[PDB]
Amino acid sequence: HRYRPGTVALREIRRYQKSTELLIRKLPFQRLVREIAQDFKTDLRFQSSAVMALQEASEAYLVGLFEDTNLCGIHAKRVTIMPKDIQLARRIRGERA
Amino acid sequence: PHRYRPGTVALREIRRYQKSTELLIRKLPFQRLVREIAQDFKTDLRFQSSAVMALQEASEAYLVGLFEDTNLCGIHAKRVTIMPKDIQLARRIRGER
Amino acid sequence: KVLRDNIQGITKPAIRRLARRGGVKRISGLIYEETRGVLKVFLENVIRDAVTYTEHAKRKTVTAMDVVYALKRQGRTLYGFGG
Amino acid sequence: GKGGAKRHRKVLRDNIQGITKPAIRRLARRGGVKRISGLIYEETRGVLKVFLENVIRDAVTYTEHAKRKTVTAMDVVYALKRQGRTLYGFGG
Amino acid sequence: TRKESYAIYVYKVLKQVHPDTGISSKAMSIMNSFVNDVFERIAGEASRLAHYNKRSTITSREIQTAVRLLLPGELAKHAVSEGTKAVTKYTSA
Amino acid sequence: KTRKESYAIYVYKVLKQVHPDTGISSKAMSIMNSFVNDVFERIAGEASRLAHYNKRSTITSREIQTAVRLLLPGELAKHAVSEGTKAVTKYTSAK
Amino acid sequence: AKTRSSRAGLQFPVGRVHRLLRKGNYAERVGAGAPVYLAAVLEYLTAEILELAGNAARDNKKTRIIPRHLQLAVRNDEELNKLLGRVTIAQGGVLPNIQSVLLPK
Amino acid sequence: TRSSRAGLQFPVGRVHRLLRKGNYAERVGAGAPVYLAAVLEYLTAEILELAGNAARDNKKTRIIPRHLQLAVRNDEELNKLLGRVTIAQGRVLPNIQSVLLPK
Numbered sequence: 001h002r003y004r005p006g007t008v009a010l011r012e013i014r015r016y017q018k019s020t021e022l023l024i025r026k027l028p029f030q031r032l033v034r035e036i037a038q039d040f041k042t043d044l045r046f047q048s049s050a051v052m053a054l055q056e057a058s059e060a061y062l063v064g065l066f067e068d069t070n071l072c073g074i075h076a077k078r079v080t081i082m083p084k085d086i087q088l089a090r091r092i093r094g095e096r097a
Numbered sequence: 098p099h100r101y102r103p104g105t106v107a108l109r110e111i112r113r114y115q116k117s118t119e120l121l122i123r124k125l126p127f128q129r130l131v132r133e134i135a136q137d138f139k140t141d142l143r144f145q146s147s148a149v150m151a152l153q154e155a156s157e158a159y160l161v162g163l164f165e166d167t168n169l170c171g172i173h174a175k176r177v178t179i180m181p182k183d184i185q186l187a188r189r190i191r192g193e194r
Numbered sequence: 195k196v197l198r199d200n201i202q203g204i205t206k207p208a209i210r211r212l213a214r215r216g217g218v219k220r221i222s223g224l225i226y227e228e229t230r231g232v233l234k235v236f237l238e239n240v241i242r243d244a245v246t247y248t249e250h251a252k253r254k255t256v257t258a259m260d261v262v263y264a265l266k267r268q269g270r271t272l273y274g275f276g277g
Numbered sequence: 278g279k280g281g282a283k284r285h286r287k288v289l290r291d292n293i294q295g296i297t298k299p300a301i302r303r304l305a306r307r308g309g310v311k312r313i314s315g316l317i318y319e320e321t322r323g324v325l326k327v328f329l330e331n332v333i334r335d336a337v338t339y340t341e342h343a344k345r346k347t348v349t350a351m352d353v354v355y356a357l358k359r360q361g362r363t364l365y366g367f368g369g
Numbered sequence: 370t371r372k373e374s375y376a377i378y379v380y381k382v383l384k385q386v387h388p389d390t391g392i393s394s395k396a397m398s399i400m401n402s403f404v405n406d407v408f409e410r411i412a413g414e415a416s417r418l419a420h421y422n423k424r425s426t427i428t429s430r431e432i433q434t435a436v437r438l439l440l441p442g443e444l445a446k447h448a449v450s451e452g453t454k455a456v457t458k459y460t461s462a
Numbered sequence: 463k464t465r466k467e468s469y470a471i472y473v474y475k476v477l478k479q480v481h482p483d484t485g486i487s488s489k490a491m492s493i494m495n496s497f498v499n500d501v502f503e504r505i506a507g508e509a510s511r512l513a514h515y516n517k518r519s520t521i522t523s524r525e526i527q528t529a530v531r532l533l534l535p536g537e538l539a540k541h542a543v544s545e546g547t548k549a550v551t552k553y554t555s556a557k
Numbered sequence: 558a559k560t561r562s563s564r565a566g567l568q569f570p571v572g573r574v575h576r577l578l579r580k581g582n583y584a585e586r587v588g589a590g591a592p593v594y595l596a597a598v599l600e601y602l603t604a605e606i607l608e609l610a611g612n613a614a615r616d617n618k619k620t621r622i623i624p625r626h627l628q629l630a631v632r633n634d635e636e637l638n639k640l641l642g643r644v645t646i647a648q649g650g651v652l653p654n655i656q657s658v659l660l661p662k
Numbered sequence: 663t664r665s666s667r668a669g670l671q672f673p674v675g676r677v678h679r680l681l682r683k684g685n686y687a688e689r690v691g692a693g694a695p696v697y698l699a700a701v702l703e704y705l706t707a708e709i710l711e712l713a714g715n716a717a718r719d720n721k722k723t724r725i726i727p728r729h730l731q732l733a734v735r736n737d738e739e740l741n742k743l744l745g746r747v748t749i750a751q752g753r754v755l756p757n758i759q760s761v762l763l764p765k
Contacts, residue, residue: 013309020753023304031291050350066308068190080312083320092166111214118648121211126203133197148258151275155265164216178220219659243532250528251516273402274647342434366750369499381568387611391621416583426586441639448598455597456590459565480711485724493750510686523693549700553668
């Protein structure tokens with residue numbers, strides 16, 4: 001496999017693409033919601049899927065984010081996603097001010 | 098003998114031009130152009146003079162907004178002048194197209 | 195006479211003023227041409243939406259009213275001139 | 278400096294400490310950037326939080342306009358629909 | 370033949386709150402447009418919900434939630450209040 | 463019992479029409495009905511909108527016809543109309 | 558009182574809005590205090606917007622109110638322009654706002 | 663009978679009912695139920711097959727979620743029609759950005 005410099009960097013990427021499993025765990029996420037959902041109302045219940053569905057939404061939501069972030073990052077002469085790279089992306093999409 | 102230092106005039110107007118409401122595009126050429134394409138679906142059709150303005154406003158503002166997104170990205174790079182890609186970059190991210 | 199040499203009508207200065215309105219400070223030579231292309235893109239699609247209703251209505255003299263609904267479709271609602 | 282019948286119970290499923298950091302990087306590479314800043318990924322969850330609330334806000338509302346205790350997944354869909362992120366696959 | 374406007378309803382309330390003040394003719398038109406759009410997003414909202422759980426009625430609560438969701442907080446909650454009071458006002462009378 | 467009807471019979475023959483001994487998951491099947499029902503409201507709602515703009519009170523085929531044209535881009539749209547116009551045209555021929 | 562609006566204490570048209578809820582196909586049955594509720598609501602909103610519109614007009618040395626006065630009035634308030642974020646303005650005009658860094662040393 | 667007289671694969675006497683119960687206009691034009699079944703079938707067919715192609719591209723007997731988006735996402739046209747409608751267990755196209763090359 002050639003040498004070692006930036007060897008995995010592109011490798012993991014590819015394997016992750018071929019797959020289609022959830023990027024983030026499905027146990028911490030499950031409480032995260034239960035916990036905030038309480039603050040806006042009491043005595044809450046949850047459909048098995050409802051979360052499954054959120055996970056799907058969210059994950060997908062972030063990737064998408066990163067996907068631009070990357071571009072921005074490239075624009076900059078950089079291969080590094082940065083704390084702001086996040087902001088511009090959002091700002092111009094418009095949720096971020 | 099005197100000539101204003103670079104970047105002293107441009108900002109001054111920015112604002113002057115920001116305060117006011119009045120349209121920037123020309124009444125005659127605009128109109129001709131609108132007629133040019135409309136013919137290309139169906140030839141020789143008419144519009145109330147206002148109907149033309151209705152159309153004129155919706156796009157004049159539309160650019161000014163895009164130019165604003167183009168500028169942030171110019172800034173993000175440590176740059177100073179809105180370059181081409183930025184516009185396109187902007188276009189791609191908004192994912193209108 | 196088919197209208198052409200139109201695209202230019204929107205000369206150097208006018209494209210520029212928009213941008214100041216935008217809050218851009220300065221501008222390279224190249225993009226005066228790029229924007230005209232888009233402007234055209236945008237007009238085409240809207241007028242495309244607008245014209246159909248007008249045809250739908252058994253008329254030629256396409257109304258301001260269509261300009262707008264057609265704008266509401268693409269997703270650029272306007273407050274000002276309509277209904 | 279005592280045993281003092283000490284009992285230790287702290288909270289790491291729901292709370293953001295608990296969740297897994299690789300779980301994110303897992304996410305980061307699908308996009309395929311080479312590098313992750315420490316600062317950055319903390320912000321990213323930050324936003325996740327912002328996105329997550331608004332939805333549930335609505336979710337909760339639809340659960341409650343019907344006087345229902347069980348929150349429907351459809352309920353989430355409409356929510357997404359309102360922000361323009363509607364999900365095919367679910368709940369026609 | 371009968372051009373409608375909501376100019377009449379704006380016209381009173383204007384004076385009720387800023388009596389040394391007036392409206393532009395187009396500014397009023399803008400407001401006419403605004404209300405109707407505003408009337409429709411809500412009405413639209415209302416209708417969808419009715420249908421969702423098959424409700425052959427837009428009651429006084431179906432609108433209420435609708436607004437709650439449609440509107441950003443500070444504005445939404447005041448409006449919720451004015452709403453019930455009005456029902457309060459009107460039914461006994 | 464329960465209802466929860468869907469377009470499963472229609473999507474299935476279509477796929478048969480385009481690769482007969484070709485298969486599908488039970489997960490892509492709902493995506494499909496979700497997708498159809500979604501396009502359904504998109505088109506029929508817009509028809510409703512035009513009807514009570516230029517001042518009339520029923521929704522015919524013409525309107526869909528118009529609607530479709532601006533709801534979709536150049537090349538698909540024409541073929542789509544064509545198909546649409548004929549299917550019905552034949553329908554009337556019979557009667 | 559005869560006029561409904563007055564029985565509910567308002568300026569907004571009770572019955573004109575009722576009919577508009579039947580000519581809009583929105584549904585098979587129209588509610589009885591819906592109409593009012595709704596009328597009253599907008600009433601507030603109008604006010605809400607129209608309350609500062611005037612204040613803006615005061616701001617700039619005029620006794621009347623031209624449309625920009627509606628525009629600034631809506632953009633500054635976060636709970637105002639937030640909803641209308643999808644509303645673009647007959648000759649809206651612009652908030653003076655110049656980005657941080659291009660301003661000069 | 664409907665499919666027959668019309669000559670389509672889609673249900674003509676099903677969308678007529680919903681369009682009258684949705685409550686679109688006052689009455690309903692005779693045009694539409696029939697026309698409305700037709701384009702729908704046309705779209706139905708346009709995806710199945712490219713989905714088929716996509717499954718065969720990477721050599722598979724059965725089509726599954728992953729395939730469907732692969733089909734559409736790659737296609738220029740469909741992709742725009744369903745530009746922002748987002749998708750069940752879908753994952754994504756292989757993409758490698760330029761200056762991220764392993765030289």
